[PDB]
Amino acid sequence: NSIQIGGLFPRGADQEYSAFRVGMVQFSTSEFRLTPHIDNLEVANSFAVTNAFCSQFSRGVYAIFGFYDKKSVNTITSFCGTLHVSFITPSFPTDGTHPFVIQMRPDLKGALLSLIEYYQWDKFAYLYDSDRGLSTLQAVLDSAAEKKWQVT
Amino acid sequence: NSIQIGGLFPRGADQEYSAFRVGMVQFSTSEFRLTPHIDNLEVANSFAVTNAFCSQFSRGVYAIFGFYDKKSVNTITSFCGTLHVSFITPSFPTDGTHPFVIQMRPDLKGALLSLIEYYQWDKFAYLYDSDRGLSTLQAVLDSAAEKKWQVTAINVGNINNDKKDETYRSLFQDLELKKERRVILDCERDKVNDIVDQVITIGKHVKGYHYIIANLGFTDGDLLKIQFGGAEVSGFQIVDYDDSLVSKFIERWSTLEEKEYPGAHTATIKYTSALTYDAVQVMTEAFRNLRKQRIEISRRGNAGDCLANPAVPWGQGVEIERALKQVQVEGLSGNIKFDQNGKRINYTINIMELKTNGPRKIGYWSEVDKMVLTEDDTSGLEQKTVVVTTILESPYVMMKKNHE
C-alpha cells in the first residue's frame, strides 16, 4: 500500500532535505509508507516550478511537498486551487486565502506586532529584502499609522 | 502574408480590446497582415494564464500580446525567457530586466518621485494596490530614507467591498491622527473612483487636501466629482489629446458605432486601451523590418508541448526579440521605443493639475528631464479668493450691531 508524494526541493536545501529524509523514516508504518518523487529544482523560476508540478501530476501523486518563492508562489496556489491537488510546504504564508495549500510556517507577522508593543518603540529602522518578500513589512507599514511608528 | 500572434485579454477589459480591433485596420497594408487568436480568460488565475499561453505555443505563434496580474506576471515572464517567445503587454512593467518581454506601459516610478519633489513634499500618505506590483512602493520607501521623508504606506488593496463604509471611515480616522493633507493613490483607475466617492462622503476634499493619482489615466477616471471641492488634484495623462495624431484617431473613434465597438463612442480612451492600439503598430513594423532585412522567421514545424523537457528554444525568437525591440513608431501614447530588455524608453508623461476648469496640461516629465513646462496661457488673473482667518475679540474684530 505504498503512497506517492511530490517532493519539490531547491538545490541548496541540504539540511531541509536531510530532515525530510529523516521525517519519512520515523513515521512509516507496517501497512503503508510514502514514495516521494524528488525534483531538485531552482524554485524561483516560475517555468521550472510549473513544469515540475506537472512532472508530478502525470506521475499521479496524492499530495506535493515543496517550497516556493515570491515569484513562483502565485503559480502553485492557483494551480492547486483548480486541479484540487493538495500542496504542503514550509515556505512563507500565502498573502490571502488560497485553498488546497498547507503552510507549516506559522504566521510570523502576527507575533512581531506584539513584540514592538512590549518594548515600547516609536522610531526605528526596518530592513527587508524584496527576495524573501515584504508581506511582513507591509503589515508593519499598515499598522504604522494606528500605533504611531516612524519606520525608516 | 499571414503572421500568427496570441492574445490574452481580461474578460472585463472590453475597451482595452475594442482599441485592438481598430489598430488592425489602420495598420493593415497590402504587403501582409497580422492574425490574432483570442482567449478571454481570468487574468489573476495563473493556471488559466499558463493554459492560455501553452494554447498559443502549441498552435505555433511568433509573439503574444496580453496582460498579467501580480498573481501571474511571473508566469508570463518565465515562459517567454525560456521558450524565446516575445511578449507584448500594456500592464505594469516587470520588476526587473526580463528578455522577450515588450512592456508597452512606461515606468511611472520616476514621475511620482519628482512630482513629489516639485510640490516640495516631505510627509504624505501612500495608499497602494498590490494588483500592479510592489515596484512603486519600494521606490518611495527607498527614497523615503534618503531624503528623510516621513511616509505612511497602507496596503489599501486588500479590503472587502461589503464592509467598505466602516473601514474607509476608519482609514481616514487613522490618517486623521497625523492630520495628513497630502495623499498619493496608487490603485487602478477602478479602485480610485471608489476612494474618490468615499473622500466626498466625509468631506475630505475641501481647501487644504491635495491628492496625486498615480496612474497613467488622469482624464480616464471620473474627476468631476472632486473638482470643485477646493482641493488640488494632480495626476498623469499619457494620451495627450492635444496631439493631432490622437485627434485624427479620436475623430474616427468618436463616430464608430458602440454596439460593434464597446466603450468607443466617447471622446476619451483609457490609457490601457490607447497603448493597445499603439501595440499593433509596433508588431506590424516589427515584421515589416524583418521583411526588408531579408530575414526568414517562419517556424520550422510543430512547436510541441510547452512542457517539453529540456525546453528547446527556437532560435528565430532571438530575431523576433531583436525585431520587436528595434521597432520605433508614433501613436496615441506619444513616442514609442524599447531597450534591449523591452522596457518603455524615450517617452513623455503629461502632468495634469485638476483646476476649476478641468484637467490642465500644467507640466510633463521625461526620463532625462523632470518638470519642464511653462504655465499654460489659459488661466485667470485674481481668481483666487484668498481665505483669511481671525478671532472675535473686541475691538480687533467686532460683529456690527446689525451683523445679521
Swiss-Prot record, chain A:
Mod. after translation: Palmitoylated. Depalmitoylated upon L-glutamate stimulation.
Compartments (UniProt record): Cell membrane; Postsynaptic cell membrane; Postsynaptic density membrane
Induction line: Down-regulated in the pyramidal cell layer of CA1 in the hippocampus by global ischemia.
Tissue expr: Detected in forebrain. Detected in dendrites of neuronal cells. Expressed in the pyramidal cell layers of CA1 and CA3 and in the granule cell layer of the dentate gyrus.
Function: Ionotropic glutamate receptor that functions as a ligand-gated cation channel, gated by L-glutamate and glutamatergic agonists such as alpha-amino-3-hydroxy-5-methyl-4-isoxazolepropionic acid (AMPA), quisqualic acid, and kainic acid. L-glutamate acts as an excitatory neurotransmitter at many synapses in the central nervous system and plays an important role in fast excitatory synaptic transmission.
Subunit structure: Homotetramer or heterotetramer of pore-forming glutamate receptor subunits. Tetramers may be formed by the dimerization of dimers. May interact with MPP4. Forms a ternary complex with GRIP1 and CSPG4. Interacts with ATAD1 in an ATP-dependent manner. ATAD1-catalyzed ATP hydrolysis disrupts binding to ATAD1 and to GRIP1 and leads to AMPAR complex disassembly. Interacts with GRIP2. Interacts with GRIP1. Interacts with NSF via its C-terminus. Interacts with CACNG2, PICK1 and GRIP2. Interacts with GRIA1 and SYNDIG1. Part of a complex containing GRIA2, NSF and NAPA and/or NAPB.
Family according to the record: Belongs to the glutamate-gated ion channel (TC 1.A.10.1) family. GRIA2 subfamily.
Additional facts recorded: The postsynaptic actions of L-glutamate are mediated by a variety of receptors that are named according to their selective agonists. This receptor binds AMPA (quisqualate) > L-glutamate > kainate.
Entry text on domains: The M4 transmembrane segment mediates tetramerization and is required for cell surface expression.
Protein name as catalogued: Glutamate receptor 2
Source organism: Rattus norvegicus (Rat)
Name of the gene encoding the protein in the UniProt record: Gria2
